[PDB]
Amino acid sequence: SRKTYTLTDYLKNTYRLKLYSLRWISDHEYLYKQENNILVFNAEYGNSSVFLENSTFDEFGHSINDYSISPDGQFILLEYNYVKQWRHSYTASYDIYDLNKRQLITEERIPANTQWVTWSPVGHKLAYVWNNDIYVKIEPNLPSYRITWTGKEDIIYNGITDWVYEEEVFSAYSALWWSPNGTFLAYAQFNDTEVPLIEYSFYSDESLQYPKTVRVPYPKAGAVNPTVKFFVVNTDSLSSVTNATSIQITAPASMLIGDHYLCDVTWATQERISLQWLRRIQNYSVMDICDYDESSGRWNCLVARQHIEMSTTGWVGRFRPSEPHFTLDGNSFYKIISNEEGYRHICYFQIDKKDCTFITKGTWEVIGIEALTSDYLYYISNEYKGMPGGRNLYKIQLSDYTKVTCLSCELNPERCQYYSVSFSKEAKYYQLRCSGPGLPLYTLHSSVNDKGLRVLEDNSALDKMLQNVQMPSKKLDFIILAETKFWYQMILPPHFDKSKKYPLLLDVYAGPCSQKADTVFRLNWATYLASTENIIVASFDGRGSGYQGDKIMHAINRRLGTFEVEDQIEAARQFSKMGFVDNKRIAIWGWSYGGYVTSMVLGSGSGVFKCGIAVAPVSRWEYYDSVYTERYMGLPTPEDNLDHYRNSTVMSRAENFKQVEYLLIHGTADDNVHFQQSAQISKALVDVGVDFQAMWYTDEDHGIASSTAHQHIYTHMSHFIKQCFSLP
Amino acid sequence: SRKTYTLTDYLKNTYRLKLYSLRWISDHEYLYKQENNILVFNAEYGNSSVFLENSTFDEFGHSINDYSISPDGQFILLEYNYVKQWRHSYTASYDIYDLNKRQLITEERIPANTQWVTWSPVGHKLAYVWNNDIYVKIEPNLPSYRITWTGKEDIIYNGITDWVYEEEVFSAYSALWWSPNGTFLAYAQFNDTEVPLIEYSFYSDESLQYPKTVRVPYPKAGAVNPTVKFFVVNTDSLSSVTNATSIQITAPASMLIGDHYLCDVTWATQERISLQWLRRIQNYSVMDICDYDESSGRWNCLVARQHIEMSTTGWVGRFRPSEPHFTLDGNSFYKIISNEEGYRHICYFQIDKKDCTFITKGTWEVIGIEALTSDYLYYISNEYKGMPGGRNLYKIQLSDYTKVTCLSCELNPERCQYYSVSFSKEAKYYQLRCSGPGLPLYTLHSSVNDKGLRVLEDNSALDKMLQNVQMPSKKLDFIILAETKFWYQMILPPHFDKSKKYPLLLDVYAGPCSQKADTVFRLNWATYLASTENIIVASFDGRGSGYQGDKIMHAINRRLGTFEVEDQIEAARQFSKMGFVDNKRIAIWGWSYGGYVTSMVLGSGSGVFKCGIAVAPVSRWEYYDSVYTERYMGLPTPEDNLDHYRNSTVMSRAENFKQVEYLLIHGTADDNVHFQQSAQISKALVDVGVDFQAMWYTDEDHGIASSTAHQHIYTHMSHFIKQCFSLP
């Protein structure tokens, strides 16, 4: 045979997966960027035309990072001077171009160093955050109205989140929610006054004589948490002479008694907001329904409308309480709830009524609700062929729950088992996105008869290129551990010989609600290790893994670093039992939570693993943030869960590392899993006389995502793995 | 045949060198700590008596770190709760025990967290520094008198130095000088108001949830330097009702015009102080002679008494201007000055007279002046057998300079070639300390007819143990480079075979005024590499090296990282020509300046070296302190020497590291050569796609001196050297 998938192919993106990233602008039209032009596509017919030529901004004088067309199509917001902050946050410069007048706006521009910009859902109003304060523009050429005056760097945040809310609660920077009409603007206010600061050196460029100290409010497990306030402004009654009036919506009494989080904001109608609150002890959540009082200007939340969601075996939701999906009248909603058997299913709720009705059931889970129309509810689930790592689109008939139709299951069963979807406004058309086991396929469909309209992207160019490469194969199967099915995946080398013994690398994450065994197609480091190095790369989903019910997911509750570590050891013991694995060449590696599990497995003294690599690992739960940690571990106090926080550290296992080859890697500017975590592992290994390998990446964060750093880390880990497996 | 000197022997200090640490307390007596007792010895006869049994402090309740007996013998100052700070500084708790009354002083105790304590030179007065302020106790049981009120943490320092003065100027924490009588107390005041702070994380123990940021005023090359003021207090006229009056002594006009340092304080008589000042441009120093005016209470320094010392080829002195050694009347003195040929010799100066008279000359240098009597001047030099790395004691007859007598040269010429000395007060006796080439020998002698009195320590216990070990040998010789002799040393394996090819490791420092080729006996890492691993460990003294004249030393002036790097490359090329070196197995390593040279040699693209290890290296001169850097490099400005600062970095040679195996090591709490230095090397290597090896040591400083860290680093470097040389 001929060429293999090399490390250089992975690092240099030689074999590009093609995407079809579309933006719906109505119930029947979408925008698409097809090189040097923006095109508008008609979903029913498929005809297109140039919406905007990229030649329009040749004389702009800055590199445009991104754009946003206003809902009415009248304006385009141009984003340039992009400066990345955390996982979702960034700062940028913004300019507005009038599409009808065909010119840039010179007067009353969005200021430089803007934290977040948002168009209203309809029309052309703007809400932006500058210096932690909210500003509203009714028209792009008109002056802004100031909404908040309390904004203070690292202390008060209006309309944007602090570190912990961005990372753990909202999974977004924005804390601004326009009403459907664009009449109201709802926002959250974060107060970090007494939140302790994580401090670290930033070395910057060679030209900087003195390193900079970065100071970030970050609550570690058990520390003072930021507080939250919720407000609503009427953007239609803004005065140029008088200051803007913000109406506060207070949290329920069952929340105000102690520490709590605002975990969800959903507009139900033009005058109704849904708010979900969660206690610091993350097993109790309350949903409030708040209506606008036209004859007072205030917002009232009846105690009778409050819906409580609690857990007896663990925490609420997968990572957070699930979002409600309101019916058009806003008097009822659907939401994914854990049932009496522990499976996550769609529940139907009526506002002034007692409980809920489950509309789905079974030994599988609903992944998410995608669309809701008058007649149907569209959702993604892993029901098909009882594969927890598969994803398909289904629709349930709202007039008969037994009438469920799989929409994606049989489109291409050998090639397509993992779908995601993008619905048009009002769900008239949908784009299906299959990500495996074969090459990604993008298709356009009509909700009317569920007829296929067009193939958008088939990846035929990649298909032909990959026919020319010795590609590895993927086996997706399960093993039995204590009368339960646990899924695993294996990346097997090309020309796989079952009578030959191959070295095995265990790729681990194993965090709560994780899934490493799935039907997704990937071109990654594992692709190179199996194709060029002839190493079996295995992944296993044990106790604590998600999408298989709470019996499996909650098994890890108040006990991180126990069953998920043990289950990785047992998986490797069982893979060793298969006659195609060299029992003397078993390695393990992982990033973030994966790094914590790798380190815990290496310090277990199982004797199964020869070597391992931990990238940016957690080492002790007290060093990680309060929101994520306390969700699974409780508080680190003698009354709560101190004993388990003390017994679940990497440092305490330092003695057992004498039995293994260990490579420890961490970025110095990691704002998420602080360098401190690895600084403590290295110190405990040195204190016990254990030799190991280390690598720091100057100014790299959790992702180690800088082009040169990404290439260096993978090159360094490849040399380590090859040396450990005696490969040339 | 039998056992070799193993890595474990080095790390576990299996073969300990015995010392004879004595403290002269008079012209004929000394103190010696001889197991469970402090003894007093009579030099002439050798008889002794117990002075203090350590059973006295069995019920003290703290571990005594050190002690200090008052000059009059009446009190002992006990040091406990020792907390190390920088190279010289520390904090401790102090208690005073009355030796006559045989009880602890319970009233008016030295406060906890005392920065520095000092007995007066005669009697029992105390001067201590607490919270950056000076305090004086006339008697140990009496209350203190406050001298200064200006003390401010990290800003104003009274009687103690800031970071830069401790490390570079005084090579000591103390900035307090009692007059011989103990009448006056002279002190320096340091002001660090506008000095920029170096900031770095301190991780501490596992129990610390948030890392601490350490902030130290540290001027990097070209930054704002601390300012200095000098004062004198009369300790005999201190009032309990009135505040202490400090008389300020102003720097000369030729110093006040810009930035300057106070570089030396020497009491000449009871009423005369010598002060040496140095300009920020370190080629001009002024010595001031200051006399007490009894009819004014003021100190006056005549401009006619000022002695200027300037350099035309480099900087003043070896590391700083040399100290004056005054004759009893204080009207004349002796100083080591560089002569017209560039050799450092003893100069004789008379106070109200124009220049000086050289009393020594030749192609060798005076290392230091050790004692001065009415008849003789005692000094150490490297004259014997023209060996720059040898050290011997000589005496010159003050009535005839041609009458020079070597006092140590012929005591044991095969065993003893490197001496240091300790004279009694008034120099009636001297202890000679020979540190090689054989095992250290400690002897006592009488000055009258230079008769050997006693052998104090012969190391006979080590001698017998080493007879049982396969010990390596040392060859000390020279090679010619551009018509000049340059010395090198080689640690050769036992049973050395000149017809066999051995791997070579080059051990480097090469800093200005350094010496790595000498006659001293050492039990170190090199001893193990040659004895167990059969590796030749070589060291070379090239351009910039000291004790061979200014032509060699000043060759590197305003050009660090040029000739000393080139000369290490040429030494290895010449060792390669010798037929006992494997030219394919040549490695290089160094610590501090040695790490900078190793990195510069590895990035030179010479192709001579296979691998190298740099421990805590300097990478760019702008990151290192102003005092040391500017001495050799000038200022990093375009009007001065910016072009060489920019051309002499490790980062700029990053491309050439593809040709070598590199191991980079640095401690994270290094307050001297900041971790920033290695953080910038690693980042430049990653930016260029160079794979290398790294190791950080959490909370270790420049020394990486913690027992567990010292063992780990040497174990890690040994594995690296062994794999690079293909050794099992």
Ligand SMILES: *[C@@H]1O[C@H](CO)[C@@H](O[C@@H]2O[C@H](CO)[C@@H](O[C@@H]3O[C@H](CO)[C@@H](O)[C@H](O[C@H]4O[C@H](CO)[C@@H](O)[C@H](O)[C@@H]4O)[C@@H]3O)[C@H](O)[C@H]2NC(C)=O)[C@H](O)[C@H]1NC(C)=O
């Ligand atoms: C962000 O959060 C912080 C807390 O982390 C919050 O700051 C707190 O503000 C309040 C009110 O401004 C202050 O509380 C007071 O303390 C001062 C003394 O320092 C007293 O004057 C106060 O007593 C008076 O007022 C009381 C009620 O208002 C009554 O007892 C009586 O009328 C008194 O006259 C009171 O105890 C406090 O200084 C801070 N806390 C901290 C830790 O800084 C801040 O306001 C928040 N910012 C926003 C925009 O929400």
Ligand SMILES: *[C@@H]1O[C@H](CO)[C@@H](O[C@@H]2O[C@H](CO)[C@@H](O)[C@H](O)[C@H]2NC(C)=O)[C@H](O)[C@H]1NC(C)=O
């Ligand atoms: C798809 O094709 C139709 C039909 O040609 C386009 O609709 C026409 O174009 C303009 C702009 O909307 C109107 O002024 C005409 O009256 C329309 N004619 C008809 C017969 O509908 C349509 O815009 C095309 N869509 C895209 C996205 O290119």
Ligand SMILES: *[C@@H]1O[C@H](CO)[C@@H](O[C@@H]2O[C@H](CO)[C@@H](O)[C@H](O)[C@H]2NC(C)=O)[C@H](O)[C@H]1NC(C)=O
């Ligand atoms: C060494 O021994 C001598 C002689 O015994 C000691 O000197 C004498 O002893 C006492 C106590 O100091 C004095 O009162 C006598 O006047 C001394 N006589 C002479 C002739 O010196 C001496 O103290 C001993 N030294 C040590 C350090 O033990």
Ligand SMILES: N[C@H]1CN(c2cc(-c3ccccc3)ncn2)C[C@@H]1N1CCCCC1=O
């Ligand atoms: N901060 C922690 C957050 N996290 C998540 C969060 C989510 C998620 C999915 C849907 C909605 C909201 C959040 N899904 C997967 N992982 C892993 C991460 N983490 C865990 C420990 C180590 C470091 C790290 O970043």
Ligand SMILES: N[C@H]1CN(c2cc(-c3ccccc3)ncn2)C[C@@H]1N1CCCCC1=O
């Ligand atoms: N700070 C720098 C100071 N230094 C010295 C100083 C002296 C010395 C000798 C007699 C009197 C006063 C000073 N002797 C040898 N080395 C090397 C060191 N240094 C140089 C660069 C790298 C880091 C370091 O500590």
Ligand SMILES: *[C@@H]1O[C@H](CO)[C@@H](O)[C@H](O)[C@H]1NC(C)=O
């Ligand atoms: C939207 O919201 C309010 C009432 O909900 C109304 O007064 C306003 O003018 C509305 N605008 C529309 C429906 O276009």
Ligand SMILES: *[C@@H]1O[C@H](CO)[C@@H](O)[C@H](O)[C@H]1NC(C)=O
């Ligand atoms: C929440 O957790 C605590 C602490 O483990 C527990 O005692 C309590 O019953 C929980 N709440 C619910 C609703 O189960």
Ligand SMILES: *[C@@H]1O[C@H](CO)[C@@H](O)[C@H](O)[C@H]1NC(C)=O
């Ligand atoms: C220290 O120096 C500053 C200028 O940096 C000056 O304002 C201040 O007076 C000084 N303090 C003392 C005690 O000399």
